[PDB]
Amino acid sequence: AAVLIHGALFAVVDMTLNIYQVQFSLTRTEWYLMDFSDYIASFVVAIIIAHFGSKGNRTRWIAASCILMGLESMLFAFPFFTYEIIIPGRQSIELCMEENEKRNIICGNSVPNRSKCIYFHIGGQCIHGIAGMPIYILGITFIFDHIPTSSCGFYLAIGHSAYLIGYLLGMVGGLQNFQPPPKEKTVEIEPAKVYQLLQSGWWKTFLIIAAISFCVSFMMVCFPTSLPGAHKLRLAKRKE
Amino acid sequence: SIYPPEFFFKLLVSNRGVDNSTYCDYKLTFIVHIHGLPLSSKRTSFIVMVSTSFFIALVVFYILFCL
Amino acid sequence: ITPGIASLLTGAFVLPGGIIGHFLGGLIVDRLEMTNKNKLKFTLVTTVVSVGLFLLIFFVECQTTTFAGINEDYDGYGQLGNLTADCNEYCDCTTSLYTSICGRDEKEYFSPCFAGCKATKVSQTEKTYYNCSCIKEGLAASDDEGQFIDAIAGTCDSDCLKLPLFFAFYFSATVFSNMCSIPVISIILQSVPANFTSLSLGVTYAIVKFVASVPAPLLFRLSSAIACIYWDNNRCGGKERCWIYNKNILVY
Amino acid sequence: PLSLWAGWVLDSSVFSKFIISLIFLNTFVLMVEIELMESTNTALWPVKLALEVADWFILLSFIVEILLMWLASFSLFWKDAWNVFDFFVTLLSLLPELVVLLGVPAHSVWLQLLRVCRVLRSLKLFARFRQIKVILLALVRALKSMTFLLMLLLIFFYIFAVTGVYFFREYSRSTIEGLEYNMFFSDLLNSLVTVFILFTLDHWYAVLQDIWKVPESSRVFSSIYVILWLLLGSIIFRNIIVAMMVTNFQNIRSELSEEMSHLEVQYKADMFKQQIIQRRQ
Amino acid sequence: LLGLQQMILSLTQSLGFETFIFIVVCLNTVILVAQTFTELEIRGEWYFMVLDSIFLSIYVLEAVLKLIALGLEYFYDPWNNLDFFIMVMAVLDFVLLQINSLSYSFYNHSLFRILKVFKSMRALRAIRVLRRLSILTSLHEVAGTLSGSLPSITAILTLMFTCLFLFSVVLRALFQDSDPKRFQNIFTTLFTLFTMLTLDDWSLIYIDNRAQGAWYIIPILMIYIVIQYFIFLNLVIAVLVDNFQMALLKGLEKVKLE
Amino acid sequence: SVYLVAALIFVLMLTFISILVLSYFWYLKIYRQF
C-alpha cells in the first residue's frame, strides 16, 4: 500500500517532467537536471537512512518517509495551479495581441515564472528521492529480518511488482487526461485548452496522491514498534 | 349467449386524396361481422385471482373441517 | 509509430512480462527453497537464453521495412532543407513539430503543412489536408466524398506486421530479466548476518543511482546523436530536434 | 535420467486430462473454423486468428507429445497400434502445412480433405468409455465370423453388375428426348453403383419404369433381372447378416454363462475343500 | 413444521386427493384432444382459455402443496419432476401472454405455438391415471424387456450418432458449393446425413451432385451406408433379439419353478 | 495476419517449454526420494 502510490507517483512524474520541458519553453539540458534530482536524492539517503535504520525503529522511519511523500507530491502540484499563466497561446495579454500571430509566439515572458517552478520542481524531485528510497530499503529490510527466507521472495516479488503496477497506471491513468479530449481537432484554441487540462490534470492527480501517502503513514505510525509477530518468531529463532 | 362473442364494424373506404385517376370519390360505407373475438387479459386474470382465492378458501376450511 | 503512441507501446507491454517475471521467478526459489548453488545455475541459463532472445530480435531488425522521406534531395526539386520553400512560409510551418504526411504516391512527405496544403477540413475521426500544392504529381486514384482528392495526415504504413514478432520477442526477454532480479537479491540476504542485513540493502542501492544512472544518460546521449546525426541545423540550433535517427546504425 | 523423464511426464494424470482436453478442443475448433470463413462481418476477423493459432497450438503440441513417446521408448513405439496410427495421422495432418508452404500442385480438391483428418484423433477418446469397448470388440469378433458371406456378396455384385451392362445397352444407347436414368448402366462403374442402389431398395420401381420407357429392352428380361436381384440380393442377403450377428451375440452369451458356471463350481469345490483342512486340523 | 406439514401430507397422499387430481387431468386431456380438430377449437376458443386458466390455478394448488408437504423428496421423484417442468412452462406462457397483445401476429409467432405444445405435455400425466385403472399390463412384458435392453441401446445409438457427426463434419468441409441447397450449413449437413440414415431418396443426392458438382460423393455415401444401415442398425436388431431371448429363458425356468 | 498469429504462438510455445522445466526441477526434488 505504501509502494503502490509510490509506484503510482513516479511514473506520472517522468511524463510530467517531460511535458513540462516541451510545453513550458525549456531546453533538453534542464530536464535531465530535474530528472537527476530524484536520482541523487535517493543516493544521499540510500546510505544515511540505512545507517539510521539500523539503530532505530524501522516502522517509525518508513511512515516518516511516507509522510515526506505526501509533502512532496502536492508540492510538485503547486506550480501547476499557481503558474498556469506561464505559456498559454494568448493569456499573456501584456505582450501578445489577440489579432497578431507573430506577437503571440514571441516576447517570452514564460521563461520567468519558469525557473521559479523549476525550484518547485527540483525540490519536488529531491524530496522524492530523499524520502522514497528509505521506503524501499527499510520495508524490505523488515521483510528480511522478520519474515522467513522461504517466503521473502514471495514478498520480494510483490514489492517489486507493486512498483511496476504503478509504472503502468502512472502512465495509464495519468495519460487519459493528458491525451487530448474528444476534441483534438478544433481551431488553435485547443492548444490553449489542452494547456489548462494538463496542469489541472496533475494538480488534480497529485492532490489525491499526496494525501494517500499521509493516511498510509498514519496507519504505519500506529503499527507497533515491537512487532508481536516477530517476537513469537524471534523466540522460535532464538532457541535451538 | 352460447358461442363466441360477435361484433359489427361499420367501416368507410374512401378515395379522396389518394387517386389522380378520376374525379370520382368512391365513398363505400359497409358493415362487417367479426366473430371469434378472444378472451381479454383483464377478464383472464380476474378469473384467476378470484378463483384461486376460492379454492384456497376451500382447502383451508376443509383443513379446519378435519379438526 | 507516433511518439506519444510509441511511448505507450513499451509502457503498456513491458509490465506484463515484468510482473510475472518476479512472480514466477520468485516463487521458483520460494517453493523449491533453492540453495546458493541452485540459484547460480538458475541465474545463468535464465540470462543466456534471454540474450539469444535479444539476439533473435537483432536478427528480426535485418528484415527490410517501408521507407518515408530521407530519399536524398526532394525528387531533384530541392535539397535536404529545401523544406523551407514558399509553402512553408504561407501556412507558417515550424521546423520543430514537423510530422510526416503520406501522399497517394506512397511517398512520405514531412510537415503536412509544408505539403503545400492551403486548406484542411478535419473530420471527427481523422485529419486530412486539401489543396496540397507542394506535392508532386502523385495522386493516382486518391479519393474522398464531400470533397475530392486530398492527403491524409500522419505516416502511412503498409508492412508493420513484423511488430507482433518484435513484442513477442520483447516479452520473453523481459520475463527472463525479472526472474534474474530475484536470484541476485535473494542471495544477498544469505551471506550477511541478521543484524547486518539492514545495511545490506544500502550497499547495493548506493550503486544503483550513482555508478549506473549518473553515467548512463551521457553514454546514451553521445550515442543518441551518433544515430541522430542529421540534426535540424537550420533552426533548432544546439541539437534540439533530429530528422534522421539512423535506422541501421541505432539497431546495430 | 533421460528416457525416465519422458516416461514420467507421459504418466501424470492431470497431464493426460489436459491432452484429452486438447483432443476435444481441436475437434471442436475445426468445426467452427469451416463455418466462419464468411465475409458477412468484420467482427469475425478477431476470432479467425484466435481459432487458427489454437489450431497450430494443438498441432505442434501433438508433435511434441509424439517426440515425447519417441524419447521414451523409440523401440516399442512401432508396436502399439494406436500410437503408431496416431503418428500416421499427425504425419498426414502436418503434410498440409508443407503443401501450403510450397503451394506447388494447386489449391484443389485433394488439398481440403488432407486438412480435415485431424479430428480423427478423438476416436481414442471414446476407448475410455466402458461399454463401447464391449460392443466394439464383439462387433469386430462377429465381423470376423461372417467373412465368407461378404465374399458371396462380392461375387454377386460382380454377377449382377456385369450382366446389367449387357441387359441394358439399348437403354444406355438411347435417343428418347425425355429420360431420367439414362446413365445408371452406361459403364461398369456406373453399373456397380447401380447394383448397390438396387441393393438398398431405393427407386427400384422408378428405374424399372424408365427402362420400360424405351421401346427396346423387352419387359421380361429387365423385370426378371430387377426382381431377382431385389429378392435374392436385397431381402435374403440383407437378412442373413442380421441372423449371423444375432448368432454371434448368442455365442458370446454362451461363453460368459459357462465361465460363470465354472467359477461357481470352483467356488463350490473350495467350500468343499476348505472343510477338509478344518477337519484335518 | 411438524403438525402443519404432517396434516398437509395426510391430506396429500389421501385417497381422494389423488382421484380429484386424476379427474382434473382426464378432463384437461379430453379438452386437449378436443382442441385438435379446428372445427371445435375455433368455435369453443373462449371457453377453452377460461378452462385453461382454471387448470393453471389448480396446478398452482397442487404443486405448491406437494412441495410444502414433501420437501426435496418432491423434487426426488421424476413423475412429479415432469409435472414441475410442465408447471414452469404453463406459468411462463401465462406471463408471456399477459406481457403481449393477443392478436394475429402473436398467433402466427412461432414461440407462442412452441410454448403451447408443452401444454400438450400435460396429457402425459394421463398415463398415471391409466396406470391405476390399469393398462392391463398387456405391454408390461414388452416394456420390461425394452427396459432391460436400453443400457446397450443408448451406447450403440450414441456410437452411430458419433459416426454421423464425423461424416457430417467432413462432408461440410468438402462438398460446399456442390449443391449448396442440401448442406450449405453445418446443421443441414447433419440433417442430410441423418435422413440418409433412413435410406429415403438417398440416390437423389448422388444424382443431384453428379449433375452440377462432381461424383466423388459416391464412395463416401457407399461407405456411409455400409457402416450405418448395414452394420449398426442390425446391431440394434441383434441386441433386442438377444434380450428377448433372455426374457424367454427366464420365463421358461420360472414356469417350471411352480 | 500470419505474423500477428505467429506472434501469439511463439508466446505460448515458449511458455509451455518453460513449464517443462518447472516440474522438472520440482521432480528433481522428489526423484531422490525414490
Ligand SMILES: COCC(CCO[C@H]1CC[C@@]2(C)C(=CC[C@H]3[C@@H]4C[C@@H]5O[C@]6(CC[C@@H](C)CO6)[C@@H](C)[C@@H]5[C@@]4(C)CC[C@@H]32)C1)COC
Ligand atoms: C410402476 O412404478 C414405476 C416407479 C418408477 C417410475 O419412474 C418414472 C420416472 C419418470 C419417467 C422416467 C418415467 C416414466 C415416464 C417418463 C416420461 C415420459 C416422457 O417421455 C419423454 C422422452 C421421450 C419423448 C418421445 C417424450 O418425452 C420425456 C420428456 C418424458 C419422460 C421420459 C420423463 C421421465 C418419466 C418412469 C417405481 O414404482 C415402484
Ligand SMILES: COCC(CCO[C@H]1CC[C@@]2(C)C(=CC[C@H]3[C@@H]4C[C@@H]5O[C@]6(CC[C@@H](C)CO6)[C@@H](C)[C@@H]5[C@@]4(C)CC[C@@H]32)C1)COC
Ligand atoms: C416392475 O419394476 C420395474 C423396475 C425397473 C423399471 O425400469 C424401467 C426403466 C425405464 C423403461 C426402460 C421401463 C419401462 C418403460 C420404458 C419406456 C417405454 C417407451 O418405449 C419407447 C421405446 C419403444 C417405442 C415403440 C415407444 O417408446 C421408449 C421411448 C419408452 C421407454 C422404453 C423409456 C424407458 C422405459 C422399465 C424395477 O423394480 C424393482
Ligand SMILES: *[C@@H]1O[C@H](CO)[C@@H](O[C@@H]2O[C@H](CO)[C@@H](O)[C@H](O)[C@H]2NC(C)=O)[C@H](O)[C@H]1NC(C)=O
Ligand atoms: C482550394 O480549395 C478550395 C476548396 O477546397 C477551392 O475552392 C475554390 O476557390 C475559388 C477561389 O478562387 C472559388 O472561386 C471557387 O468557387 C472555389 N470552388 C468551389 C467548388 O467552391 C480552390 O480552388 C482551391 N485553390 C486553388 C488554388 O485551386
Ligand code: NA
Ligand atoms: Na426407402
